[PDB]
Design a protein around this ligand. Structure first.
Ligand code: FMN
Ligand code: FMN
Ligand code: FMN
Lengths: 352, 326, 352
């Protein structure tokens, strides 16, 4: 049917870019393209990557004697480093252990797992990987209110401590099901993508926030006015993202949108940043630019492909270790120091 | 002998600027100049005032049905509106009830009292006026380490819930080292007051400050310096949520409170206008000024489409490159 | 063990870029990569190079009748041209004559030799090459104060006339020892990289400046506030560098950071600039931008690989000759004239 990698092993991650080409060797071409690809000719995916060169880190003298500490807290969860796992569908395309494998890596590492509504694994399978670890549940806005009630109940029953409401549903130049949604779509026509609204409104955000009983992050924000509207509608977090360039084409690199959003949010709610994080330097730059944590996506999936949970763990370990080095060089003892970094504005962009 | 005003009465505050001239009629000349005056020819005091015209508010549509609510919280304490009382010395120059009067107005209103290092009332006198209300103690850095340890113990025993370390006086200027010494021994969150440069904010936080208090002390210290409000955004962007920000120096209107919040302050501190209210009516006069700011802020919230203090933190400001003369 | 080149000969240096590929042919692959490589994917090494195109030289009419003179003075040492040798570890990776070979080229040319704490040559070997020439000693900040006392004593005993305190210790996508540090680390656990603080503080600078009995340059400065802090802590010089892009990744090209630092230093102490100097035009641009001298690194090492001391000398000679031509074209009679040059701001960057 679909011959996903099944090997479990640690990997020596020197950088995350090479994981893409390495994964291409073990992942079936179709599944690999699904994971790696983006809208149009990928210009906005390239923009997500090149945006990091727009603001450059300065090395700075230390002001504290202690060894660097990457730990932080979000929504009262203490986590080992300022990154969490982004919600990503169909991990089975990368590895036979699928979302259970990712959840194991995330829980063992000591951060938060985001569960896609479109998970290929059952929650029971994921739960076994999580082994008590914190988890957030990502949902789409259903056209049918009953389906929103259903998924919100599922999330709470599954011990979710936040909801991630993704603003965009579903663009470029599927071997298994989705048990988590099928659980409540069975016997309805919707269970036989189109069940969700293509785009959410402030009214949608207000409905989910009122009925979730959990803090709601609105994911896919790129414009500061949307951030303000979302918070006024009852969002408890803003998740700055263009979903790894998988949706709107010929849009800005995600990092370029972050400061304007952070300035408008002005501490009202936590900010999660994603779309293009590949290096420890990127984590630091996002924090310096107003994010509280970043979310990791494709690199963790490529690690999963290459080594199951241990491969995914290796990627998380890479980010933590690289971040520590960046902290040393920038004179930062802790995650809060990173939030205070001055960045060099590079008007020349990528080619310098 | 000094004949300070002694009457206690509410006053109809239409604007705070007029309180200065009105207070000049009742406060002895020497004391009044001490309160109203600033360094040099007062150009930086004027700059504190004119800076508010550099960033202008937009009227905007509402997105919530509820009436405005000015309440906020700082360091876990719920307060009626996003402003506190600044530490000011020698309130007896303004009114016979001195700091007890101001403390009464502040506690009756429902916000935080800052107690100056150079208060003319005893703690017992101030405590009576506070009636259990929250208070923060402002200190200068003593050259003697034991005097610092003693003042910090005294503050904590007197029920202080924060320490305000004023950067400019005692040592005439503080260093990161000084901040570290105070933060390490206080048992309370320490605000560093008098910050105008973002690198100082970063150094202070790294040295152990639990808050940054953006201030030029109402233009009473360095002359030919920027208006305090112009320094706020750069500091806020560098602090980047690490610790709460108190802003002061020039707040005269509800619009100023809104603009400070939109620019990264958590609360502002009020100074001269409250003292002028005290001169004019004792605690009830000072209360009248706090009430004015609360009511004026409520109007500004309505007009900007803001239901609560958080909405204020999200406002967009119009950049006015023309400055005061437009 | 390690088959370093040993031939001694002059080389016809047409440009320094070609010396890299030429050296790659004679230097063992491992040692060559150590010398040539930089952090991440080398984007910041490329930035060091491309930064030179951000400020362009104007040809200008002459105002003096005399022939150009490249001589200058720093810390009262008169030197033949406004460049010195940067401190670089393990010259034996390039050539069997190692640091003695470099020191000979530098001393014969008539400039200052910087001695890395991580030299592969003994001081006695280096001294023979130096033959009385001026030398500065580069140190790292030891965690153990005794080790700092030791190296400061070594430097003075070796006739050093300045200390170079490198701010960063030890990042990318060793056949011999270090006799200079082993001399005082022997019998301690440290002698059996981790002995130094990862990053220095102003307090560290103050300690070294108070106990050195010599002017102390703080090396690795890229931010003006660090320059001010370093000077207030007792530094007698600022050495603007990102260590040839070998430390912090996704940082600015070193030359782009120089004017802001020079403006803050405001003549208080001399400035040494390095990281990417490849041409006489670069020396001129650095001087026009506030440096007193530049330091040369990789090109001198590649020359050493290709021809021992005579090869290294050829590179120094190339820079002096090329600088002279630049002086003629810019209407400059002397090094001071270079400090007064107007540069053309190029907002387009490298691709123009
Ligand atoms: C294979 C793939 C599937 C994804 N599925 C979802 C999804 O189910 N829900 C969602 O909110 N985001 C989804 N995302 C977007 C991610 O949450 C995240 O925003 C993105 O991976 C970040 O970009 P990066 O991985 O390039 O750094 C997916 C991304 C990819 C790579
Ligand atoms: C009369 C006078 C006395 C002051 N005394 C102190 C003091 O004891 N300690 C201190 O930190 N600030 C002191 N300040 C500064 C205030 O805390 C505050 O920063 C200032 O009043 C704000 O400016 P504004 O009142 O013009 O808005 C004083 C200010 C004035 C007006
Ligand atoms: C092979 C290599 C080893 C180095 N070792 C040291 C070192 O021991 N101490 C130090 O302060 N800098 C060291 N550096 C950095 C240099 O002092 C200098 O900053 C750098 O070579 C300048 O960049 P460029 O050679 O590309 O022009 C080293 C650089 C390289 C190329």
């Amino acid at each position: 049917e679909y011959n996903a990698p099944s090997e479990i092993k640690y990997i020596d991650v020197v950088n995350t870019y090479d994981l893409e080409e390495e994964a291409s060797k073990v992942v079936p071409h179709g599944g690999f393209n699904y994971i790696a690809g983006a809208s149009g000719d990928e210009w906005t995916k390239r923009a997500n990557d090149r945006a990091w060169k727009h603001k450059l880190l300065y090395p700075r003298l230390a002001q504290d004697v202690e060894a660097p500490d990457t730990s932080t807290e979000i929504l009262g969860h203490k986590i080992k480093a300022p990154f969490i796992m982004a919600p990503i569908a169909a991990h089975g395309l990368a590895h036979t252990t699928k979302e259970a494998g990712t959840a194991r890596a995330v829980s063992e590492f000591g951060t938060i797992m985001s569960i896609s509504a479109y998970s290929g694994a059952t929650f029971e399978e994921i739960s076994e990987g999580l082994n008590g670890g914190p988890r957030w549940f990502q949902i789409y806005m259903a056209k049918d209110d009953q389906q929103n009630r259903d998924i919100l109940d599922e999330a709470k029953s599954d011990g979710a401590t936040a909801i991630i409401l993704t603003a965009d549903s579903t663009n470029r130049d599927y071997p298994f099901g989705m048990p988590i949604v099928q659980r409540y779509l069975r016997g309805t026509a919707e269970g036989m993508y189109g069940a969700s609204k293509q785009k959410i409104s402030p009214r949608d955000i207000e409905e989910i926030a009122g009925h979730s009983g959990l803090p709601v992050f609105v994911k896919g924000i790129q414009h500061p006015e949307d951030a303000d509207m979302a918070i006024k509608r009852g969002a408890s977090g803003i998740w700055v993202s263009n979903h790894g360039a998988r949706q709107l084409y010929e849009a800005p690199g995600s990092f370029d949108t972050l400061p304007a959003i952070a300035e408008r949010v002005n501490k009202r709610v936590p900010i999660v940043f994603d779309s293009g994080v590949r290096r420890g330097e990127h984590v630091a730059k996002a924090l310096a630019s107003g994010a509280d944590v970043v979310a990791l996506g494709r690199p963790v999936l490529f690690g999963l492909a290459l080594g199951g949970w241990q491969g995914a763990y290796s990627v998380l370990d890479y980010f933590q270790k690289d971040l520590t080095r960046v902290m040393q060089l920038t004179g930062s003892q802790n995650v809060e120091d990173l939030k205070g970094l001055d960045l060099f504005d590079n008007p020349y962009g990528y080619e310098y």
